[PDB]
Symmetry: C3
Subunit: 602 residues, 3 copies
């Protein structure tokens, strides 16, 4: 009347054991484990065949796998339809596990990698550690269309972490969110030639990436997050060559040679990312150091960016780099129809190369920027520049050969529009801007601390020649205000009713100016003739001046007034931004860099 030794060991033996529910143990087997198929789980014993039987059994009976041990395996394993919770797989270094419609949580993939081959796959709260394959999580040549949620995983110690190659069946939708990827030697997330994919959306969001160092590795290795469509680049190539409708939002990329990269992307947004590039990592892989690098892209925004470069600024300050593509050594595919905005990168610089044509429109917006150098090439059909705080401007509109990517390639004889509102180029006391070849038919400009010159490409080609009057002042006195630069066209209205019109932009310094002798290294000047605390002979900080003979080897010294008139040692004094190089003798003149001409009415 007792249970037999046999039968209890049979495939129905658990049916003999009662449980508090009133059912039996056989009814409690909601899973299988690899140990039930012979796995040792010691991380050393070869468990490959045990794993294969588990997968076969789970597929055939549609039963989830539970595991907690460490399964050493030595050759490829194919999985289809499996739900797997827990455990560690330990490959040879780069051994492959393929998944079709697989759901995996709390798994550690040690010294191996997962290759997704199709279906609806889901990966949560896993660890991918120490892979020596090209990628730790690979999407390539899928045999059926896929969707993917790849979220809250941690990946480290590998080469590429997440890599997609766009051959095969399409991924229609993918979310890559809240992963933690660190201490790797390839890209953290690279989606290569995926223009056909992600029709219903690609979203790469809230990933935290740290220490991407591809030193000594292959070409292009070491990008933080990268998305690539298909060449050839070109302003008019078909929409189907581009990766479209995707977003890269809220990620953090620390200590990486090139944090964010897109080429041949269209209709996309790069929003609120935080990046810390470093010239010193991924040595030899050929990447241009920066936070955001975009090539040949159209119809996109960069909206919100923070961080700074970790290397010394003398090596690089490049943070935003928006450029043409290249086909076989020839530039092609200017970026067009884009918005750069809300960047908070005061230490770091922006470089943009675009274009404009009669054959297609290009409308650009740059807005709400805090940066270091703002460097720009190209003349869109319309370009607006609003609330840019920068430390210098390096700007050429219709740039020619030798003046930047695609110089000379396109021109636009039709209506060309530009606007500059509320911008500030200022570093300490210096306002440092350079503008050229702005062949605009209309240019509105207000609220800037500088004037923007526009140019004419052949007589009559941009309408009547006009100068926008951006500054007008009132003085309670009649004498022209000295020592302060005014652009051409500036009007001064006097309380008496007189008015001055500036016909050659510049500043007034009397021909009777005399300064005290100077010595090398001196950063102030003192008056030996005129009253610099009068309005007519005043000295305004920010004004560019020339001190004859005071520069290197007796050249003229061009400098900036750093502090306006004050009295010390009973003399009128100003400070200059650059020290005297060659000493000057008593009663040397000082002059404006740009001497004003004005006319007076009444």
């Amino acid at each position: 009347s007792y249970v037999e030794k046999n039968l209890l060991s049979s495939t129905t033996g658990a049916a003999m054991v009662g449980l508090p529910s009133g059912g039996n143990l056989l009814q409690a087997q909601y899973f299988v484990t690899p140990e039930q198929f012979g796995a040792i789980g010691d991380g050393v014993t070869d468990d490959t065949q045990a794993i294969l039987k588990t997968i076969t059994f789970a597929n055939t009976n549609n039963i989830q796998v539970r595991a907690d041990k460490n399964y050493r395996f030595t050759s490829s394993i194919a999985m289809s339809g499996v739900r797997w919770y827990g455990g560690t797989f330990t490959g040879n270094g780069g051994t492959m596990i393929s998944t079709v419609s697989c759901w995996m949580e709390n798994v550690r993939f040690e010294k191996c990698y997962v290759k997704m081959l199709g279906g609806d796959c889901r990966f949560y709260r896993n660890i991918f550690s120490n892979a020596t394959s090209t990628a730790a999580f690979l999407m390539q040549a899928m045999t059926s269309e896929g969707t993917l949620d790849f979220s809250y995983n941690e990946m480290y110690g590998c080469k590429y972490a997440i890599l997609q190659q766009g051959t095969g069946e399409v991924m229609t939708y993918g979310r890559y969110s809240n992963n933690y990827i660190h201490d790797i030697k390839g890209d953290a997330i690279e989606l290569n030639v995926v223009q056909k994919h992600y029709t219903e959306g690609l979203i790469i969001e809230n990933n935290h990436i740290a220490n991407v160092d591809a030193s000594g590795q292959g070409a292009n290795w070491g990008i933080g997050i990268g998305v690539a469509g298909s060449g050839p680049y070109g302003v008019d190539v078909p929409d189907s060559q581009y990766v479209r409708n995707f977003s890269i939002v809220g990620n953090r990329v620390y200590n990486c040679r090139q944090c964010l990269h897109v080429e041949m992307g269209k209709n996309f947004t790069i929003r609120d990312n935080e990046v810390y590039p470093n010239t010193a990592v991924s040595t030899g892989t050929g990447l241009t150091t920066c936070g955001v690098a975009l090539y040949g892209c159209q119809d996109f925004e960069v909206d919100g960016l923070t961080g700074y470069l970790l290397n010394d600024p003398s090596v690089s300050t490049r943070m935003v780099f928006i450029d043409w593509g290249v086909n076989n050594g020839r530039y092609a595919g200017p970026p067009i129809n884009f918005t750069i905005k809300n960047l908070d990168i005061p230490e770091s610089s922006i470089e943009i190369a675009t274009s404009g044509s009669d054959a297609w429109e290009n409308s650009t917006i740059v807005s709400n920027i805090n940066c270091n150098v703002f460097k720009w090439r190209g003349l869109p059909s319309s370009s607006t520049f609003n609330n840019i705080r920068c430390r210098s401007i390096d700007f050429i509109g219709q740039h020619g050969s030798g003046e930047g990517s695609g110089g000379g390639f396109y021109t636009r004889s039709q209506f060309t529009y530009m606007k500059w509102v509320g911008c500030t180029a200022l570093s300490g006391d210096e306002t440092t801007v350079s503008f050229a070849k702005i062949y605009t038919d209309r240019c509105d400009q207000v609220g800037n601390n500088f004037g923007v010159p526009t140019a004419v490409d052949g007589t009559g080609h941009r309408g009547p020649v006009l100068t926008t009057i951006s500054e007008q002042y009132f003085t309670a006195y009649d004498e022209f205000p000295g020592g302060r630069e005014f652009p051409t066209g500036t009007v001064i209205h006097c309380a008496s009713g007189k008015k001055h019109v500036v016909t050659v932009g510049g500043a007034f310094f009397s021909d009777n100016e005399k300064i005290k002798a100077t010595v090398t290294g001196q950063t102030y000047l003192q008056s030996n003739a005129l009253n610099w605390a009068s309005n007519g002979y005043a000295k305004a900080a920010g004004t560019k001046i020339v001190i004859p003979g005071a520069g290197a080897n007796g050249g003229d010294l061009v400098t900036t007034i750093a502090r306006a008139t004050y009295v010390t040692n009973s003399l009128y004094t100003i400070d200059i931004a650059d020290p005297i190089v060659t000493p000057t003798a008593e009663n040397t003149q000082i002059k404006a860099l740009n001497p004003v001409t004005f006319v007076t009415v009444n």
Copy 2:
């Protein structure tokens, strides 16, 4: 000395089996399974009663349920306090499972739906598939106050996915985050008449929604994400009728007739959503196609929007639609106190209808916009418009009957303020704006490529009559600059000291202008008399001109200069934006659309 066959099958039988811990199997029963209560799990056998006993046992003993099979059930199941992990429920199509204070993970609800009835409920990493009930996840007539975290679930194949009806006990807090909802025939997330709910917050964030097609379904079906308070609409109805303090952030809604909808919302934010409306889906359900539709709302912002419409633009370009509500065929409840900003939707259009009164203030801000048509009705007590790039402006301030929602209903005789700074209305070569009925006491305007006319509603009612001078220019020459439009009040300062004041805004074209004969379809004009490459007879691109007799049936052709003066075939030439319709003979005049009048001082 051997175990009996009986007793081992008893409810304590597992106590006889030793484990490596040194305990017994009975101590390892941390869960129950449905199979322990007779469930077959084959998806075909009716397991309803087995499921009910499981729920009873789990509730009574506070023990979690584990499952992995497929439980066909055929009538309603009520659950309270249950923690359930895994398995598939398969109903008849719309069979109900109710939950009170339930926690569910990794469950598939197939052909059935969950109805939440109260407590603190949590749903993670579930699938809701193929429901034929009205909603797949329903909140209605809760019998106790609730909180809800509904996150990282996938829902598809249903009618409504998530639906709340606000009757019963309140949901005090709810987070709906990171769900994937697709291929449905009702709304993806609809919270209807929930003004009493969400005192401690409603947050709808980072959901990815795709393919919402309610064609052939009931009224209003097919909204992407919708939130509704209670009628009647009205500017002064009680705060308690509104859904308040909620947020809709970071969602993606692809291929949906009306992606985001709020009515009777107050103190809310719609931030950084990406939407792709489509006129072709939800045929017959009566929705206005767009990305964001807001009715009767107050104290809100739309901050950040991307995407575009999937249908052909000839059918619709409507993306943002902010409008009054309607009570029984009468408009009521103008939107007031709102901010529209940071929209990146260059292909798509914005339509806003508001109002202003002496009885209440309405302060509006529209800022940092990239859009197609900007259409506006209504005159707030203060309205600011900053850094708007658009392709046309269609604007009426105090709009009357027949000119938009609520036209004529309210007026404001007190101080009314408006500002336009740094805006651009431009499509290729055309600046296309229409303004009327701007009855402002002060209007500041700078940095725009157009002038904003203000109007007076009865003599003296807006102070002395002033025209803001928005443009002033300098010329090195005395002749008036030809061929370029200047608003009324424009001042031209000459290097000689002369000045021109524009007393009737417009452009100068000499009465002696003669052009060569033209033929139908021609898009250029050539001079037969004057030197168009002189400043006085210049031709600026963007200027609107009239070619007598060249329009349809010999009407005048109003067009725009597309390219300023150039020489070809030894003649001064300009391009026009619109082709000649009716041919013109040699020595026809060309004129400004708006002929200038100016006076010259000196």
Copy 3:
């Protein structure tokens, strides 16, 4: 031939039971449970020793723990390397569980707290309820370097929820995301003196916090989210004293005395948070009520803020408070190099106290703001103010002793720059601004509804004395436009060619103005002499006026025209913003607050 009673109970007994896989029950033991070590799980029996053996066994054999019951424990438990799923721990109130490299999910920590001591720890989907210890989740004196993911947990009923004390080994990286913290009596998230920590990043994002009420508790208790570096404060103290490179993004903090707090932070961002402060909670703990409070911080942005205060506005409207630090009763450490932008807080106020020096630069940006009072102290080396909508401005540049934090401490004689573009100070009909001590060398200002006066700190010290002309108007008539305020320097161009230049800013009211008698409480005035519907004697709403003798005790009444000229009862009428206090007799004069002086040319 039957199984023995013994042996089946042995540590290998499960090996005798067959399963459908063909393996045995021993191979299915992927976990241990506390009941296998003697735990009763009734929440009452002391299970402390049972828990300790479980931890020992799990550590020694590297096996996960599963649990579902309620384990009462009574003294500290140390855990290292454990993977624990499920169950409830119930301490004495504040009993400690320590973790080193622990992974915990679906656990409830009742009346106890977790103290993290190092390694890589992970906490998901847990509940921390009713702790009476100082904190429910404590990081302090870690014995090895840590990383932490603390996400999707719920915490309530405690004192501090999450607290870190920065002594011991560093946390190199931490993500605190998507938690739900409510009904607590300390801070929700407080990271105190952690300047050495988070080299690879600190990210606090998408947490929902509600009801933080530290009434009756210790000093500083009741902050929503707080991050603190190390004193002493000071503009030039070493970088190592600051918490750096962190972010506080997307959180919601409802009903809290001080929602967000940072002191001694550098290179950080506070982005898109929603906050609802309340003066009534945390009574006695000494916190300044507001949404965001920053002390002594540098190189940071506040980007995006919504919400409002829950108390009556008469008690407080303070929402943003950016201030110096304090060392031993002396202010020190001005905030420098910061950007305040994208704030949508129309009901609530902003208070900023900064500084500027020759010894270091300070570049500030305030942009795209909707607020109530905008209060500012301090004169940076460069400061820009763009698209600020506010209800009043309270501004002093180089503020002195008694005029705000750090008044008098620093001055900058070198180039000092300021810009105001497109700002609006307006409350109903009143434009209420106060500016002083703006000692700038250049100040660009356009598109505002007010003028910004700049000042000179000693003759000659800011260059020639200039007034920016911010407004110019055109009139079709010659008479000066009456009843409307114009800043000094305003130019009016007449259609006749005449021009008026405003030499003393103000408004024109004729000396022949006479009004009808008034009575107390009256809010309109009526003309008894002049035609107020003429341009020369016009009355513009918004103009500040003086009614002699009409204020309290026969003082002059200074008020604002609320409605421009209209006719009622056959008399020219205006409305005023403030009622008559002391009655005035027939034929009293009305005057401008600021009487204009102008000169006319021609």
